[PDB]
Amino acid sequence: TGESYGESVKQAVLLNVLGSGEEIPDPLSPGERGIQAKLKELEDEQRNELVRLKYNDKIKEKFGKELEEVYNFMNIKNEILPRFKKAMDEEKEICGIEDKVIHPKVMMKFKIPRAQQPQIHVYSAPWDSDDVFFFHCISHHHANESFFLGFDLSIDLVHYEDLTAHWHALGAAQTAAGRTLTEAYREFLNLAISNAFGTQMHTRRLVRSKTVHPIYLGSLHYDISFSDLRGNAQRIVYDDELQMHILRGPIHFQRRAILGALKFGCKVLG
Amino acid sequence: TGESYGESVKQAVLLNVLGSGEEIPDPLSPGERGIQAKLKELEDEQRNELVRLKYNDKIKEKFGKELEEVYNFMNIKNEILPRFKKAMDEEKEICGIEDKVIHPKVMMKFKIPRAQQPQIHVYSAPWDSDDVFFFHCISHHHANESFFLGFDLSIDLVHYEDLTAHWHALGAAQTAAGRTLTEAYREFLNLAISNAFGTQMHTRRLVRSKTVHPIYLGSLHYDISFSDLRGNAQRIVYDDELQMHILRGPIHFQRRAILGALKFGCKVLG
Amino acid sequence: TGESYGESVKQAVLLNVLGSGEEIPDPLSPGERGIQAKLKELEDEQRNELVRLKYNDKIKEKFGKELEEVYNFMNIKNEILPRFKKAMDEEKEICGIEDKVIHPKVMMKFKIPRAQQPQIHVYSAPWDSDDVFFFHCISHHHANESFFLGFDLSIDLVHYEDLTAHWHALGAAQTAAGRTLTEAYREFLNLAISNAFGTQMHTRRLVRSKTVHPIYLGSLHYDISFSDLRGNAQRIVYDDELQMHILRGPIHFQRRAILGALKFGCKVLG
């Protein structure tokens, strides 16, 4: 095998990125996301309780030692009183766990602040949803920019279209002229139908799905600049090597890796 | 894309019902059921450990307070009595650490206790198993009422049949007459074959599965009166508005939505 | 209810084996492996933390009891001796929280150490990945023994081939004659292409799959003798009812059953 080292290193890195229990959930399935978010919450609060209780167990042992020293010294005073003072100091030190270390709340807004995080909406066609779907990503603090990123993993089709509304004058009236989600979606379906690897039932299902609305499946807001998301999308569309890596394998891994690439970019490989 | 109120809000509510990792496992996959059951076990045991942690924290704080008062007032009868009262209260609080609370678990079993909750058996065809499956639902406290609910998901096919048996006279003998599961399954398969939207290879697998007994994939016991289960089984095959949400989407989403709709009737959406 | 009760018992045993959410992950999707690993880690952590909670709460209870007894007496040796006993028990239990004995070596492996276990690499064909996939099992302490086991569950074929390299003499020179993994893969694909039960588009995908290297999905490992893995693989190939039980059902459950039966020859079936 002539390509079992240079691209195998990147395959190992990609596998490491995909393989986790609280990161990169499946986009088209609320169940996987609900499992992963709860695993995150459980591990987080279990770690919090274990560290808090370890320090409080230290102080409970100190208090027990102080009481035992008092009992063993009564039957002289400073041998127990300084232990009690140290116990008071360490109890005060350990009891402050309300907002001691929550740095990931305010320091994580270095890239984007809260309520400005980009909105990714996940849609899918209603008759071949496992294979064909798309994301509609909306920007904030411009309120007029968005984009559409569509996938058909049955045939390995990737499509990207911006959706920005510009002021236009039709006659002596005005309008917000820019490609709309519905016509971009129908354009994607039309581009998918006239393709040489059509199953002869895949195309019929695409045509049937053309006349009806797509199926909503949720939204995923992440801490990353919208322009960075646009850069990652354009990177996914054109890079042949990224398409070779993230667009091969089991369909579940396909969608997981595609979400990972959209979230991170080219940093997932190497 | 463009739907003002109805379909959008119904799909939203359905997503919130399906956005939890506790309820509505995928019936086809016992691995997901095991994952969800273990997650439930971890949740319950950690809330028990949390209440024990709180009570242990209070008793440790009381002991440390007594020690600190002794240390800072050594160089107390009203304090000795209050310390005993606090210790007795904390011992009473920690006495119920037996976790013997079954009333909240049985609070929904006011009229539907165990061994009376209807059982549901999940079955699947051997060949196109991901798309075609069915439920055999058996009731208790009657031992005569049962039904069959079969979904072929790829073709959008739903079948409901009533397997209630009753006494019958056959010549000078008697029997328990009524529709039975085997012929119900065979008739459902026959109806599935004759749909016009086949695949000329799906039909081959389907008829090949017609000569093999179905595959048992587990049983489920839920806190629902069998009258409600029958009502939901009729509603899922009747209400096309319900089906347009439950029966449309990715397959893994679809089976969970079907189970949820059968469980809560029309409460999954709206 | 079907044909036999022994068959139903075997199926129930298999479903109980796969019922657990902590064992036998899906060999193709690393996300399931990550979720299962985090579940197992959380369960063991909660066991250890529950032990620690019991220890600390009982120690605090004993300390409070001794303090209350001393306070009541002040208003003999029983209070002094029990406090020393509690201190000794607490010290013994806290100092036993290392678990660094050589028993930990057998507490996880218990059969064979590191650099002595076989590793099973998982690959899948690039295009119809969720159906066709193979295991490359390479052992240790021989460095010249290995085997190949491939599955195509769309047309239901399983193939096995050893890749052992024996010393061979050709001319007046020597070579290490065995089987090339690429030859094994390509022969398997040639076997799959010429099956009469063809989809006429699956074959158009297999022929394309021939001329591209497969994707490396990971390398799992279980502490089992390599000869045992060979015997279990040849059991998967050359057994009838094992194939009828493992290779029929939903794809996810099928693959989980395949991995479980590779781990466990017939003990998985019961």
Side-chain angles (χ1 to χ4, degrees), chain A residues 1-59 64 82 87 96 104 112-270, chain B residues 1-59 64 82 87 96 104 112-270, chain C residues 1-59 64 82 87 96 104 112-270:
Chain A
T1 306
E3 282 271 28
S4 81
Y5 187 100
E7 77 180 349
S8 292
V9 168
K10 288 188 299 311
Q11 196 68 269
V13 176
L14 174 82
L15 286 183
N16 189 359
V17 172
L18 277 296
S20 62
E22 321 86 350
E23 188 86 45
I24 308 170
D26 203 27
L28 294 175
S29 66
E32 294 293 328
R33 292 183 291 113
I35 297 306
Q36 286 194 10
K38 185 173 71 73
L39 287 176
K40 178 70 170 65
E41 190 174 73
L42 267 286
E43 182 257 333
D44 168 40
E45 70 91 14
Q46 184 259 344
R47 163 183 39 76
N48 268 330
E49 81 173 4
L50 70 87
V51 298
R52 272 145 58 168
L53 200 45
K54 163 182 200 272
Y55 281 60
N56 213 302
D57 284 351
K58 284 180 180 170
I59 200 57
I112 205 66
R114 190 267 173 190
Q116 199 144 320
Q117 292 180 355
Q119 313 171 327
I120 294 93
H121 311 259
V122 166
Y123 300 94
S124 87
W127 276 287
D128 201 31
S129 314
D130 284 329
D131 308 79
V132 65
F133 57 103
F134 63 92
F135 318 86
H136 172 58
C137 307
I138 312 188
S139 167
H140 274 236
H141 83 280
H142 283 290
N144 81 83
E145 275 155 333
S146 66
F147 67 87
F148 159 95
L149 186 56
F151 286 82
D152 179 12
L153 311 172
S154 159
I155 302 299
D156 300 330
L157 175 57
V158 174
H159 209 51
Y160 163 63
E161 322 197 31
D162 63 358
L163 281 75
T164 80
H166 296 243
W167 181 94
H168 207 61
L170 61 83
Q174 58 250 20
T175 187
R179 212 187 261 286
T180 307
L181 179 58
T182 300
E183 48 192 359
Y185 170 53
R186 286 186 194 266
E187 174 184 1
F188 171 72
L189 291 184
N190 273 322
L191 187 64
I193 293 157
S194 81
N195 189 358
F197 319 93
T199 317
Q200 195 218 60
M201 202 195 148
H202 183 57
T203 70
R204 180 166 67 246
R205 296 188 288 217
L206 287 190
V207 176
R208 184 176 176 87
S209 80
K210 171 181 313 179
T211 73
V212 71
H213 292 27
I215 283 291
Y216 196 37
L217 279 187
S219 78
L220 311 161
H221 48 55
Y222 290 137
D223 172 276
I224 177 168
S225 162
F226 159 81
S227 280
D228 279 344
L229 263 174
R230 190 161 50 204
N232 297 13
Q234 296 149 320
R235 175 144 280 285
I236 297 169
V237 174
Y238 89 97
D239 192 303
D240 55 1
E241 190 276 331
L242 193 63
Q243 287 153 321
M244 182 179 72
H245 265 259
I246 79 174
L247 290 171
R248 289 185 207 288
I251 203 72
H252 186 119
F253 163 78
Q254 295 272 60
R255 307 189 259 114
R256 287 194 88 243
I258 278 155
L259 178 59
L262 174 67
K263 193 165 149 73
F264 287 159
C266 77
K267 280 73 176 175
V268 58
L269 285 176
Chain B
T1 75
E3 175 68 28
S4 47
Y5 282 15
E7 181 170 325
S8 183
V9 72
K10 298 291 180 68
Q11 198 83 11
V13 167
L14 178 55
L15 293 182
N16 318 94
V17 183
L18 293 192
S20 175
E22 322 296 310
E23 291 278 73
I24 311 176
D26 184 11
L28 269 293
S29 89
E32 191 85 38
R33 319 212 275 118
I35 285 173
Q36 294 214 3
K38 218 77 193 201
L39 286 178
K40 194 63 51 63
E41 200 272 341
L42 290 157
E43 265 290 341
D44 273 351
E45 66 183 1
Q46 285 189 355
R47 80 169 65 192
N48 300 345
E49 191 272 328
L50 188 153
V51 70
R52 291 182 69 246
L53 177 146
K54 198 63 181 175
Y55 293 1
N56 192 8
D57 192 16
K58 309 186 152 265
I59 190 64
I112 313 294
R114 283 257 59 88
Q116 203 144 310
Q117 284 183 6
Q119 292 252 313
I120 293 159
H121 303 247
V122 194
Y123 283 113
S124 159
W127 296 124
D128 291 331
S129 65
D130 302 321
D131 291 331
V132 55
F133 57 100
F134 65 84
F135 305 94
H136 180 49
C137 311
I138 54 165
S139 169
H140 295 285
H141 65 279
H142 273 57
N144 300 331
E145 280 188 299
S146 280
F147 68 88
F148 170 89
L149 199 47
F151 307 87
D152 166 353
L153 281 195
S154 58
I155 312 299
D156 275 14
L157 187 67
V158 183
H159 206 72
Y160 166 54
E161 282 172 354
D162 197 54
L163 319 172
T164 57
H166 63 75
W167 188 95
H168 204 51
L170 183 63
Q174 81 274 24
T175 183
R179 176 77 84 176
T180 187
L181 185 89
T182 45
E183 59 195 54
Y185 183 35
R186 279 135 63 76
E187 183 178 1
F188 159 71
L189 272 194
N190 267 14
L191 188 153
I193 294 149
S194 280
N195 184 308
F197 293 8
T199 298
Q200 56 149 327
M201 316 184 162
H202 180 97
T203 310
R204 181 183 54 198
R205 303 183 179 175
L206 183 63
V207 295
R208 188 183 323 144
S209 49
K210 203 206 157 172
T211 187
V212 176
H213 57 70
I215 312 188
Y216 178 80
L217 265 64
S219 87
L220 322 169
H221 58 288
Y222 283 10
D223 55 299
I224 301 299
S225 50
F226 179 78
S227 284
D228 291 331
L229 272 190
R230 196 153 41 168
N232 312 337
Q234 309 205 31
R235 283 200 68 78
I236 174 64
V237 71
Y238 289 176
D239 215 320
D240 53 6
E241 211 275 350
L242 174 68
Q243 290 181 353
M244 176 255 299
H245 290 295
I246 300 291
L247 258 58
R248 282 201 185 159
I251 296 286
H252 173 37
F253 168 97
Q254 262 184 16
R255 312 187 297 237
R256 286 177 35 103
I258 281 174
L259 175 71
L262 181 135
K263 211 200 308 185
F264 302 146
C266 78
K267 268 74 144 177
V268 289
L269 54 86
Chain C
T1 175
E3 327 294 330
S4 158
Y5 53 86
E7 173 159 330
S8 193
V9 163
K10 294 252 181 53
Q11 195 83 323
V13 172
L14 179 81
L15 291 157
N16 189 359
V17 173
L18 292 204
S20 66
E22 269 176 308
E23 276 196 291
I24 313 165
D26 204 289
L28 282 72
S29 60
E32 294 293 328
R33 293 198 285 264
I35 294 189
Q36 282 204 15
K38 207 48 156 201
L39 265 293
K40 191 172 145 96
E41 172 271 357
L42 280 195
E43 278 284 342
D44 212 312
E45 285 287 328
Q46 195 51 62
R47 273 207 299 221
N48 284 56
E49 289 182 0
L50 183 63
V51 169
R52 171 160 147 287
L53 264 291
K54 292 295 168 190
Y55 151 78
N56 200 260
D57 202 356
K58 272 306 272 202
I59 291 300
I112 61 172
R114 284 291 79 66
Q116 182 166 349
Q117 65 182 357
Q119 284 167 353
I120 307 104
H121 303 237
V122 177
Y123 305 84
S124 72
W127 273 278
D128 213 328
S129 304
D130 277 295
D131 275 284
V132 56
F133 58 96
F134 64 95
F135 301 100
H136 177 216
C137 182
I138 177 164
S139 89
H140 278 111
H141 91 283
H142 283 287
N144 58 0
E145 287 212 12
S146 47
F147 70 91
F148 162 82
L149 172 76
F151 295 95
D152 185 2
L153 315 180
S154 170
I155 65 193
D156 183 0
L157 70 87
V158 54
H159 204 43
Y160 163 83
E161 194 184 346
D162 62 358
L163 273 51
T164 303
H166 302 260
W167 182 96
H168 189 21
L170 78 165
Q174 43 198 350
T175 196
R179 185 49 69 113
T180 312
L181 166 80
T182 303
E183 285 185 352
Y185 186 32
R186 197 166 292 185
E187 164 75 62
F188 157 74
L189 285 182
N190 278 0
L191 205 77
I193 289 160
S194 290
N195 189 359
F197 274 101
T199 315
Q200 302 280 322
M201 211 75 98
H202 194 49
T203 187
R204 216 171 49 105
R205 275 173 220 150
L206 288 169
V207 293
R208 187 144 184 218
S209 310
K210 265 168 66 163
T211 175
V212 176
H213 78 110
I215 297 89
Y216 166 76
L217 271 298
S219 198
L220 73 165
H221 58 93
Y222 301 145
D223 273 357
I224 306 167
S225 162
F226 172 64
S227 160
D228 291 331
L229 280 183
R230 216 163 70 255
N232 303 320
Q234 308 182 71
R235 193 74 196 285
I236 301 299
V237 187
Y238 287 167
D239 196 335
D240 311 337
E241 82 288 342
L242 200 50
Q243 275 175 352
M244 183 278 288
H245 270 305
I246 298 288
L247 302 204
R248 274 150 41 111
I251 296 297
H252 197 128
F253 157 73
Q254 269 174 24
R255 304 204 300 246
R256 293 197 75 230
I258 297 169
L259 179 55
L262 194 85
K263 200 174 160 81
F264 292 163
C266 62
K267 298 143 272 172
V268 65
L269 203 72

XYZ file of all heavy atoms in Angstrom, chain A residues 7 61 71 99 131 232 242 257 260, unseen atoms left out:
57
model
N -1.426 9.551 4.744
C -2.839 9.754 5.017
C -3.336 8.915 6.184
O -4.380 9.236 6.760
C -3.676 9.452 3.770
C -3.875 7.978 3.489
C -4.705 7.736 2.246
O -5.292 8.705 1.723
O -4.768 6.577 1.789
N -11.784 14.633 58.487
C -10.725 13.900 59.170
C -9.964 14.805 60.128
O -9.598 14.384 61.230
C -9.774 13.276 58.149
N -10.097 14.418 73.456
C -10.481 13.316 74.337
C -9.263 12.647 74.965
O -9.295 12.260 76.139
C -11.313 12.292 73.565
N -18.732 29.848 43.102
C -18.222 30.325 41.821
C -16.705 30.433 41.872
O -16.110 31.438 41.479
C -18.850 31.663 41.442
N -29.623 9.665 3.860
C -28.582 9.927 2.874
C -28.470 11.392 2.485
O -27.362 11.876 2.248
C -28.828 9.094 1.612
C -29.011 7.619 1.909
O -30.120 7.228 2.329
O -28.049 6.848 1.714
N -14.981 27.514 6.792
C -14.967 26.059 6.906
C -15.856 25.407 5.854
O -15.500 24.367 5.291
C -15.400 25.639 8.306
C -14.457 26.131 9.372
O -13.611 26.984 9.120
N -14.598 25.598 10.577
N -10.075 16.518 1.710
C -11.072 16.516 2.774
C -12.304 15.720 2.366
O -12.874 14.983 3.177
C -11.455 17.950 3.143
C -12.244 18.136 4.437
C -11.419 17.683 5.616
C -12.651 19.579 4.616
N -18.596 12.902 11.039
C -17.386 13.543 10.548
C -17.696 14.835 9.816
O -16.907 15.782 9.876
C -16.616 12.592 9.636
N -18.254 17.394 12.432
C -16.967 17.749 13.006
C -16.168 18.682 12.116
O -15.577 19.655 12.590
